[PDB]
Design a protein around this ligand. Structure first.
Ligand SMILES: *[C@@H]1O[C@H](CO[C@@H]2O[C@@H](C)[C@@H](O)[C@@H](O)[C@@H]2O)[C@@H](O[C@@H]2O[C@H](CO)[C@@H](O[C@@H]3O[C@H](CO[C@H]4O[C@H](CO)[C@@H](O)[C@H](O)[C@@H]4O[C@@H]4O[C@H](CO)[C@@H](O)[C@H](O)[C@H]4NC(C)=O)[C@@H](O)[C@H](O[C@H]4O[C@H](CO)[C@@H](O)[C@H](O)[C@@H]4O[C@@H]4O[C@H](CO)[C@@H](O)[C@H](O)[C@H]4NC(C)=O)[C@@H]3O)[C@H](O)[C@H]2NC(C)=O)[C@H](O)[C@H]1NC(C)=O
Ligand SMILES: *[C@@H]1O[C@H](CO[C@@H]2O[C@@H](C)[C@@H](O)[C@@H](O)[C@@H]2O)[C@@H](O[C@@H]2O[C@H](CO)[C@@H](O[C@@H]3O[C@H](CO[C@H]4O[C@H](CO)[C@@H](O)[C@H](O)[C@@H]4O[C@@H]4O[C@H](CO)[C@@H](O)[C@H](O)[C@H]4NC(C)=O)[C@@H](O)[C@H](O[C@H]4O[C@H](CO)[C@@H](O)[C@H](O)[C@@H]4O[C@@H]4O[C@H](CO)[C@@H](O)[C@H](O)[C@H]4NC(C)=O)[C@@H]3O)[C@H](O)[C@H]2NC(C)=O)[C@H](O)[C@H]1NC(C)=O
Lengths: 209, 210
């Protein structure tokens, strides 16, 4: 009978590196032509702040609109658990919509990062799988990349975080490389970014031993 | 805001073992007191079927009804990609609600199952991680289990399927064992059930290599 509001956290990576800009994003769907104007109010722990930015809106292929406010956040505020309140008012709304988001609560825990070589069985293929196991980490916000010789390896896929039996999270990252690259003896690095790591970052190497 | 309909597919194990009973489940929620009568029609590839089993409505604590209908599917109908339509009629609807579900479309691909021992750096811990890599399967419906010496191992978690570059899926299963059980030389088995495996099953073993 009116729109819907959705609130999104910053990218894990954006909050760990001071050079990057972490953003909280407030998204309004089902905005129809007849009642086209949406507003936004923002709050960080009950205050209001004014540095949010409304980027102008897009017509959907179902003839409705998508409208987005974007608040930049302080890295340390996000990591310290401050609460970020989106407030949406619209003529079709009977009561304004508040929505809230925050970082997962609890003592952060350091990921353990382990590289595993391809299995003997796989070595009959033209391409092989380099595995990075990242386990024991909390909260689930994490970024994982691969490189070789300081250069980014982009042919990888990473699983979402999975809740482990001790309340921490784990994931696996799979890098796929030409078998010959693995045989010739190239070093591949899995890098992991996480708040509980020293300087928010660690790398583990993997090469043919 | 009238009733809504959720249509649930069978369990991956159920469609792969003839001994099991695969079901499609159509569930209707937010049925009102003022219009409580619900009708289901079921279709398999658009042809009506009449062997569903519908339970009588159950009132929820929020003063709405929930109504469930169960269709028993034949194993080979599901694997052959038949489509299952639940049609739901209620006098609070302006038109009946239809939902359709089937096995994801595309040519099935056989999973490659590879087992991977603990990192050397992990054998510092009291517990260690045995890994099962399952890749290159399609569709993503799969079941993964661990055992040793006949019996199920409880302490394992499996990732959801992840869409790979080539349009197939992969996942990993992690089994956590006490380091001594790995040092003692016990054999552990990752078994995988998928429609593109022979007898829909394969099992690969892992053990401390001498
Ligand atoms: C008219 O058109 C639009 C567009 O159609 C869409 O695009 C077209 C081209 C076609 O492809 C369509 O098939 C396609 O659907 C329709 O818009 C869709 O409408 C629904 C609402 O009805 C929205 O659903 C919400 O989605 C969010 C997740 O949103 C992210 O992921 C989407 C991809 O999966 C992506 O499209 C979104 O843009 C968004 O992406 C994120 O964006 C941020 C900011 O940009 C970015 O920083 C992120 O990186 C990015 N992430 C990505 C890309 O992965 C989902 O969270 C919502 O689910 C909650 O609410 C449900 C209730 O509807 C509920 O069932 C769920 O359980 C879930 O509930 C919450 O879960 C959490 C955690 O458990 C928690 O808060 C609570 O437990 C619970 N909260 C509750 C219950 O309130 C929700 O599903 C789509 O975003 C939207 N699509 C687009 C493109 O905007 C529209 O419906 C059409 N209108 C019609 C047909 O009438
Ligand atoms: C009034 O009460 C009733 C019952 O509530 C009950 O009583 C109240 C008082 C409280 O005590 C409640 O806590 C209690 O539960 C409420 O009914 C609920 O209504 C919601 C909708 O508002 C339904 O939500 C859907 O949930 C399903 C998941 O449902 C399974 O899992 C649930 C737990 O996770 C479990 O509770 C359910 O029973 C059900 O369990 C499965 O059951 C099948 C069949 O029996 C069984 O074989 C399975 O083994 C079993 N699984 C289990 C137990 O784990 C979820 O799938 C739905 O998500 C879709 O819809 C969203 C839009 O609504 C969308 O945003 C989501 O992304 C998702 O959308 C789909 O996305 C997929 C890909 O993700 C895609 O393929 C589809 O195209 C897409 N579909 C779309 C867009 O439409 C959804 O979240 C609850 O299940 C239902 N509860 C029950 C018990 O039936 C009612 O809302 C209350 N009314 C009020 C308060 O006004």
């Amino acid at each position: 009978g009116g729109p819907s509001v959705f609130l999104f956290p910053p990218k894990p990576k954006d909050t760990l590196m001071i050079s990057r800009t972490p953003e909280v994003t407030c998204v309004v769907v089902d905005v129809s032509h007849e009642d086209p104007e949406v507003k936004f109010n923002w709050y960080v722990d009950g205050v209001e702040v004014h540095n949010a930015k409304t980027k102008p809106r897009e017509e959907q292929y179902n003839s409705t609109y998508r409208v987005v406010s974007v608040l930049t956040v302080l890295h340390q505020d996000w990591l310290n658990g401050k609460e970020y309140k989106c407030k949406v008012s619209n003529k079709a709304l009977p009561a304004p919509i508040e929505k809230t988001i925050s970082k997962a609560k609890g003592q952060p825990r350091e990921p353990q990062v382990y590289t595993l070589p391809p299995s003997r069985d796989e070595l009959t293929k033209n391409q092989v799988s380099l595995t990075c196991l990242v386990k024991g980490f909390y909260p689930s916000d994490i970024a994982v990349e691969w490189e070789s010789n300081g250069q980014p390896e982009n042919n990888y896929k990473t699983t979402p975080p999975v809740l482990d039996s001790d309340g921490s999270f784990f994931l696996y990252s799979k890098l796929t490389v030409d078998k010959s690259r693995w045989q010739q003896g190239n070093v591949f690095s899995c890098s992991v970014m996480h708040e509980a790591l020293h300087n928010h970052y660690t790398q583990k190497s993997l090469s043919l031993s």
